[PDB]
Amino acid sequence: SNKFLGTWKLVSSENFDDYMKALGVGLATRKLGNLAKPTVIISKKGDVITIRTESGFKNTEISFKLGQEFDETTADNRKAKSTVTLAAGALNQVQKWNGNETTIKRKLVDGKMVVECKMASVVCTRIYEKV
Ligand SMILES: CCCCCCCCCCCC[N+](C)(C)[O-]
Structure with a gap:
């Protein structure tokens, strides 16, 4: 969704070390x-x-196109397959590698993107501010 377009700067993180651990x-x-303070730029061409x-x-x-699985080499260098979908104020990604799965859900909240990342029992939350 064009709702998500822009540049978003990390302003908060909870539980990221344990997330990467998992x-x-x-x-x-x-x-x-853990020292990274990333910027996420979301854009769209057609x-x-x-x-x-x-x-x-x-x-x-x-x-990617919504709802179509794609190959991905992650920042930590997993060779993964992911699918992103759109549901009402949220862009949701499932990312699979071997028999493993993690979710990354990006939710819009008044000028912020709240990103919930889950791997088994570990939940991580990263907050970005539109800039
Ligand atoms: C040659 C460069 C190697 C150093 C890469 C440092 C970045 C590590 C970031 C880990 C991010 C984990 N992840 C993909 C779940 O977000």
């Missing part, structure tokens, strides 16, 4: 991931949505 990210990569994530330590970018 995904099997190693200590040394985790230390960088029906192809691009989410670019920029930081001092790693940049990533995915382009």
